[PDB]
Amino acid sequence: LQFVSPFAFEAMQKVDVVCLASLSDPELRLLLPCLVRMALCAPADQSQSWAQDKKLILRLLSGVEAVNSIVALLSVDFHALEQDASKEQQLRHKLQHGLTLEFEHSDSPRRLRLVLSELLAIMNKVSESNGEFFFKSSELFESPV
Amino acid sequence: STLYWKAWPLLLVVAAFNPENIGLAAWEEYPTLKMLMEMVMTNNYSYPPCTLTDEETRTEMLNRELQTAQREKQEILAFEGHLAAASTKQTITESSSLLLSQLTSLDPQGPPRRPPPHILDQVKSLNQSLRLGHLLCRSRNPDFLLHIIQSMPWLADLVQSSEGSLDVLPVQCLCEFLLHDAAKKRQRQQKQRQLLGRLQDLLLGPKADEQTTCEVLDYFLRRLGSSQVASRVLAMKGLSLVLLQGYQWLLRDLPRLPLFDSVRSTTALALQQAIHMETDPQTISAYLIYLSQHTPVEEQAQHSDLALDVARLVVERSTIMSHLFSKLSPSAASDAVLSALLSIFSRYVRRMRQQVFLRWSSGETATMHILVVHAMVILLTLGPPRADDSEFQALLDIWFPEEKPLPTAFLVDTSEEALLLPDWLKLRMIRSEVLRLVDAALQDLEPQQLLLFVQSFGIPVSSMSKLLQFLDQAVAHDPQTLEQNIMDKNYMAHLVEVQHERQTFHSLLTA
């Protein structure tokens, strides 16, 4: 496994577009979702310097199809996902294939729902564990591919 | 209810001690008692059973038990109302029913019922104290363990409770204990070595016969096709122990079998299933190399099924394909895998030329599957291997011939022309580096498709230049409809400028 380099993290924290251009391919592959969120989403700042920063973010965002994957993931309806999550949380308070296979074959909304369900189940399991450490195994999160 | 739930363990102990007649009768006639000695031999006391891993059967039988409980509640309420009207003249409700908690339906051979938690506790205490699963392991006839075999954790703890049954005369049980094994540790290692020598005699030795060889390798293949990754790893580990340096057992040792073709047909089918279900890229590479070297080409149905399965591998597992053929690390193994897939699909295409019906420009007519056609064209995007190029060039001339039109498509059922090149595939064509694929994508593009292809990333600069030229052509043809399809003029304007440093359409955007 490759961890995020401190040079990449300080470049992200200092939002220096020339530094982000200087970083190479795999760390940008690791740092895709926030950068594409920057380049696609409605900017809070409307300054012209930030506009040049955004076009350089596009310049470095050249070459990735996971950009389009994140585009679809953003196109999934978050309000419906959120209210379904809330109802499932209330129910929890009151698949022949494996999880990795369902994540792969199922489309982006089902992927979001399944990872959300796993995270919420682990959170509830910790909250009922009350500080007692356990181990939770998921093939989706333990599949190195 | 108390008499019924306390009556189950006595009959359980009697059937466990006499499995020949009473145990078989409980296995066949009483589903609840059948489940009960299944629980005591699995040592996993859960409703639904751990033996049945099929979720829809679990939910179906749970709904059946819920309906049976509701019907029992209604019948008990009606009978208690009749008794109360006879004796005390009182109305019986759900909150005023004693027979609801004191009585249950007497259907032992009907649907299975939910065991009480204290009943499960005393059943598990009896099993731990009396080793009933160990008694069933000593019980050669009938072998309900092998009946269930025809799942790894309950097998593991059942064997650990039954160390003394390490052989068990069925060879399927021999390999089952081999996959379990894959002072006391030294004795287990020595007995595992003896069992490995016995299986090496049963597969490669003079006593290697077809029935036991097929049983051994079919058990390995079915536990490979089992959905658990630990089961897959244990099965391939056992296969390597009996027999890509980590897959040389499959590539080299397996073809050296005496009964190699007769097991290789079933092996090809089960490894097609394992290509459908597998996740590991190197194991998939080994499977593809083995199938390219060893698939029976003779059967048309088997060859078409093989091509469809590899097509599902190409399309549905595009992420695993990307890990296999990442441009960062071009490997000789990936080169050989690409050459093998090109050879397989080229042989398939030769077999047709010598579901959708496609007719060639040369006059050849056959009915393929559009997923298979997309698999060949995706291999065309994956590009020329470093070793062989003849198969690549032949397939490229077959689907994308020079200065003559493509083989046209029709539906099998309705004979209507179908879109052989979808928009995502044309996007793949444009992001690919092959000029023929790029131009073939470039012909017949809608302006909205042009906009989407320009918006998408991962595409070379020359394809950006060609897309810009085609967008300028669309401007010169119909600027009004393209401008109507344009949503954010400034966004696509900045996009066009960025691709420019990476004209007429840019002028239209600025206007």
Q: Enumerate the residues of chain A whose CB falls inside 8 A of the CB of residue B457.
A: 61-65, 67-68
Token representation of residue B50: 């751990």
Contact A64 B279 (CB under 8 A): no
Contact B457 A98 (CB under 8 A): no
CA torsion through residues A95, A100, A106, A112, sign: positive
Residue type, B167: D
Q: Which secondary-structure segment (H or E) carries B447?
A: helix B447-455
Method: cryo-EM
| Half-sphere CA count of B256, side-chain side, radius 13 A | 11
Q: Dihedrals φ, ψ of B28, to 5°?
A: -90, -40
The C-alpha of B136 sits at a distance from chain A's nearest C-alpha, in angstroms, of 30
* DSSP-derived secondary structure letter, B410: E
Is B61 in contact with B112 (CB distance < 8 Å)? yes
Residue B433 touches chain A, beta carbons under 8 Å: no
Q: CA of A97: which chain B residue's CA is closest? A: B227
Task: Give the distance, in angstroms, between the CA of residue B487 and the centroid of all CA atoms in the same chain.
Answer: 42
Count CB atoms within 10 A of the CB of residue B437: 25
Which A residues in the span 4-23 are in contact with B, Cβ-Cβ below 8 Å?
A: none
The C-alpha of B458 sits at a distance from chain A's nearest C-alpha, in angstroms, of 4
């994140």: which residue's tokens? A70
Token representation of residue B235: 């099965």
Burial B83-105, CB ≥16 within 10 A → b, else e: ebeeeeeeebeeeebebbeebbb
Which B residues in the span 346-405 are in contact with A, Cβ-Cβ below 8 Å?
A: none
Q: CA of B54: which chain A residue's CA is closest? A: A96
Q: How far is residue A130's CA from residue B384's CA, in Å, rounded to a whole number?
A: 58
Query: Which candidate from A65, A68, A145 shows the least CB-CB separation from B320?
Result: A145
For testing contact with chain A, the best of B279, B315, B433 (most A CBs within 10 A) = B279
* DSSP-derived secondary structure letter, B165: T
CB neighbour list of residue B193: distance below 8 Å, 6 or more residues apart: none
Where would I find the H helices in B88-183? 99-102, 117-130, 132-138, 144-149, 152-161, 171-181
Q: How far is residue B161's CA from residue B181's CA, in Å, rounded to a whole number?
A: 14
Residue B500 touches chain A, beta carbons under 8 Å: no
Q: Which of B298, B25, B278 is nearest to B144 (CA)?
A: B25
Count CB atoms within 10 A of the CB of residue B182: 16
Q: How far is residue B79's CA from residue B93's CA, in Å, rounded to a whole number?
A: 11
Q: Dihedrals φ, ψ of B365, to 5°?
A: -135, 130
Neighbouring-strand partners of residue B365: B359
> How many inter-chain contacts (A to B, CB under 8 Å) are there?
49
For chain A, the first-to-last Cα distance in angstroms comes to 11
The C-alpha of A90 sits at a distance from chain B's nearest C-alpha, in angstroms, of 22
Is A65 in contact with B457 (CB distance < 8 Å)? yes
């401190």: which residue's tokens? A6
Residue A75 touches chain B, beta carbons under 8 Å: no
**Sheet strands (E) in B260-400:** 356-359, 365-368
Strand ranges across the sheet with B408-411: B365-368, B356-359, B408-411
Is B498 in contact with A58 (CB distance < 8 Å)? yes
The C-alpha of B55 sits at a distance from chain A's nearest C-alpha, in angstroms, of 6
Q: Which of B399, B370, B356, B371 is nearest to B314 (CA)?
A: B371
Q: Which of B155, B163, B173 is nearest to B134 (CA)?
A: B163
What is the dihedral angle through the alpha carbons of B396, B399, B404, B407, rounded to the nearest 10 degrees?
A: 170
Burial level of B233, CB count in 10 A (0-12/13-18/19+)? middle
Residue B279 touches chain A, beta carbons under 8 Å: yes
Q: Is A95 helix (H, G, I), strand (E, B) or coil?
A: coil
Burial level of B256, CB count in 10 A (0-12/13-18/19+)? exposed
Query: Which candidate from A59, A95, A139 shows the least CB-CB separation from B229?
Result: A139
Contact B55 A59 (CB under 8 A): no
Residue B328 touches chain A, beta carbons under 8 Å: yes
Burial B297-325, CB ≥16 within 10 A → b, else e: eeeeebbbebbbbbbbbbeebeebbeebb
Count CB atoms within 10 A of the CB of residue B183: 5
For testing contact with chain B, the best of A29, A32, A52, A65 (most B CBs within 10 A) = A65
The C-alpha of A143 sits at a distance from chain B's nearest C-alpha, in angstroms, of 9
Neighbouring-strand partners of residue B409: B358
């498709």: which residue's tokens? B449
Is B77 in contact with B92 (CB distance < 8 Å)? yes
Is B330 in contact with B361 (CB distance < 8 Å)? no
Q: Is A87 helix (H, G, I), strand (E, B) or coil?
A: helix
Q: Which of B377, B384, B294 is nearest to B334 (CA)?
A: B384
CB neighbour list of residue B448: distance below 8 Å, 6 or more residues apart: B485
Concatenate the DSSP letters of all residues of B95-113 into one string: TT-SHHHH-----TTSS--
Residue B316 touches chain A, beta carbons under 8 Å: yes
CB neighbour list of residue B121: distance below 8 Å, 6 or more residues apart: none
What is the dihedral angle through the alpha carbons of A115, A119, A120, A126, rounded to the nearest 10 degrees?
A: 160
Task: Give the distance, in angstroms, between the CA of residue A117 and the centroid of all CA atoms in the same chain.
Answer: 15
Is B345 in contact with B292 (CB distance < 8 Å)? no
Q: Which secondary-structure segment (H or E) carries B472?
A: helix B461-477
Task: Give the distance, in angstroms, between the CA of residue B323 and the centroid of all CA atoms in the same chain.
Answer: 19
Q: How far is residue B392's CA from residue B389's CA, in Å, rounded to a whole number?
A: 5
Q: How far is residue B124's CA from residue B445's CA, in Å, rounded to a whole number?
A: 69
Q: Which of B382, B396, B387 is nearest to B433 (CA)?
A: B382
| Resolution (Å) of this entry | 4.6
Q: Is B408 helix (H, G, I), strand (E, B) or coil?
A: strand
* DSSP-derived secondary structure letter, B409: E
Burial B160-172, CB ≥16 within 10 A → b, else e: ebbeebbebebbb
Which A residues in the span 83-142 are in contact with B, Cβ-Cβ below 8 Å?
A: 95-98, 100-101, 104-105, 139
Q: Which secondary-structure segment (H or E) carries B411?
A: strand B408-411
Q: CA of B282: which chain A residue's CA is closest? A: A145
Burial level of B337, CB count in 10 A (0-12/13-18/19+)? buried
**Sheet strands (E) in B5-105:** none
Is B182 in contact with B238 (CB distance < 8 Å)? yes
Query: Which candidate from A62, A68, A95 shows the least CB-CB separation from B502?
Result: A62
Q: CA of A58: which chain B residue's CA is closest? A: B498
Is B499 in contact with B451 (CB distance < 8 Å)? no
